[PDB]
Amino acid sequence: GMASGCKIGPSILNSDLANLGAECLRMLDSGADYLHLDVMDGHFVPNITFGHPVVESLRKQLGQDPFFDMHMMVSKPEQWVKPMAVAGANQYTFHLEATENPGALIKDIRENGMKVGLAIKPGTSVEYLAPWANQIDMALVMTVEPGFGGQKFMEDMMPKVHWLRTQFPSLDIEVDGGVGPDTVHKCAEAGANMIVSGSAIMRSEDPRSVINLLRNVCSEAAQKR
């Protein structure tokens, strides 16, 4: 199959947001494959993080090479496609629950020169990604309810990851929510190959070591597939 082999994308929300450029560089210097940037508009989820203006500053600072995956937890994803492309995002991961026209939105993301991610919240059945799997670059199975503080990793989401992996062997599948050295085993064995992790990396004196561990656990499961 053509699934990408394991990628680790640190989430930066638990980083020092007052020094976000330096934090990102630290993640990339520790071996991050991509940067997972969580954008929340206070409507789709009960929190407000940052929008395309922060993204543009980050792009000016880091240059063109680093890959930015925008996790768009916003209620009108159609509205931010162009501003994010102009800001320099590489991938636009929108929520199935935030539009009535996913098809048109996928076309617009592509028309704007970005890769397409499609995410689903815990209550949304995995079956609803099926008609879109072959038309996207990456699927995101969330493993916490977004926008809430201090949510435990949800083991009962793994059947969604396994079902996606079984039906679409070449789809890139991301997990996002409480993923760390302990929960990554379950995510990898279930089929996920794109790992988002935040506090487990940000709490460490040695983020390179934590990213290595995540990638290595992910790989050992992927080589068995």
Tell me the catalytic residues. Answer: 38, 176
Structure tokens at 89: 């995002």
CA distance 44 to 47: 9
Structure tokens at 122: 């815990």
Q: Give the shortest CB-64-to-a second copy separation in angstroms.
A: 15
Q: Give the shortest CB-102-to-a second copy separation in angstroms.
A: 20
Under rule CB under 8 A, residue 196 binds a second copy: no
The amino acid sitting at 24 is C
CA distance 112 to 41: 21
- Sign of the dihedral defined by the CA atoms of residues 121, 66, 116, 215, in that order: negative
Q: How many residues does the chain have?
A: 225
The answer to whether 178 is a known ligand-binding residue is yes
- Partner whose footprint covers residue 140, from Zn ion, a second copy, none (CB < 5 to 8 Å by kind): none
- Partner whose footprint covers residue 67, from a second copy, Zn ion, none (CB < 5 to 8 Å by kind): none
In degrees rounded to 5, what are phi and psi of residue 20?
Answer: -60, -35
Please, what is the Cα angle at 144 between 108 and 47, to 5 degrees?
65
Binder of Zn ion out of 9, 20, 27, 38 (CB under 5 A): 38
In degrees rounded to 5, what are phi and psi of residue 66?
Answer: -60, 140
Under rule CB under 8 A, residue 19 binds a second copy: yes
- Partner whose footprint covers residue 71, from Zn ion, a second copy, none (CB < 5 to 8 Å by kind): Zn ion
Binder of a second copy out of 46, 103, 159, 169 (CB under 8 A): 46
Q: Give the shortest CB-10-to-a second copy separation in angstroms.
A: 16
As annotated, the binding site for a divalent metal cation includes 36, 38, 71, 176
Binding site for Zn ion (CB under 5 A): 38, 71, 176
